[PDB]
Amino acid sequence: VNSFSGYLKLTDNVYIKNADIVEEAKKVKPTVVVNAANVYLKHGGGVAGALNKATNNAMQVESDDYIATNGPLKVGGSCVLSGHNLAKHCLHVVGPNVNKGEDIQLLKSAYENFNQHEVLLAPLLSAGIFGADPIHSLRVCVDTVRTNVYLAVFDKNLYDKLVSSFL
Numbered sequence: 014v015n016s017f018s019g020y021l022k023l024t025d026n027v028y029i030k031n032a033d034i035v036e037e038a039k040k041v042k043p044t045v046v047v048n049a050a051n052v053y054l055k056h057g058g059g060v061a062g063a064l065n066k067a068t069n070n071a072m073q074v075e076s077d078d079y080i081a082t083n084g085p086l087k088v089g090g091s092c093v094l095s096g097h098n099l100a101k102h103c104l105h106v107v108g109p110n111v112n113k114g115e116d117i118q119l120l121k122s123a124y125e126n127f128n129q130h131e132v133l134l135a136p137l138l139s140a141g142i143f144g145a146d147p148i149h150s151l152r153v154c155v156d157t158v159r160t161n162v163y164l165a166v167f168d169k170n171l172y173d174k175l176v177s178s179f180l
């Protein structure tokens with residue numbers, strides 16, 4: 014049994030809810046919240062900007078030190094950093110950004126990072142301002158992630174479209 018409430022069950026392991034991931038993290042304090050990161054961990058906008066704002070910029074301070082030491086992530090890759098006030102840990106995952114021209118086949122590789130964690134609160138990778146089709150992102154998620162994932166979708170209109178169209 015876990016703390017996640019109000020989710021619709023899509024499969025054995027994937028659950029979905031219309032929710033602000035920031036507000037959901039604040040309530041649940043999950044072991045792992047996923048950030049929709051870029052390779053530079055520059056948390057300017059979208060989910061990353063919102064998560065970072067909720068940490069009072071501490072996520073960005075920590076991230077800048079991580080990049081200064083380790084250099085940029087790979088598209089499709091990830092790193093585990095602090096969850097600050099939102100979660101125990103933040104898994105920063107880089108999905109391909111279609112608005113920068115990145116290979117969408119890298120979306121499966123991005124979701125494979127989730128399999129290293131038993132339970133996660135996450136957004137749809139590459140969706141929103143990353144330019145991918147969120148329906149596609151949800152299909153790759155379900156067909157790739159084997160661990161228990163709680164997907165928070167910010168847009169209500171999109172949530173309803175994702176549920177109604179889910180196979």
Ligand SMILES: O=C(O)C1Cc2ccccc2C1
Pocket residue numbers: 049058059060061136137138139140141142143165166167168171
């Ligand atoms: O409505 C949503 O949940 C989308 C908003 C957003 C922004 C940047 C990255 C992913 C997503 C998912």
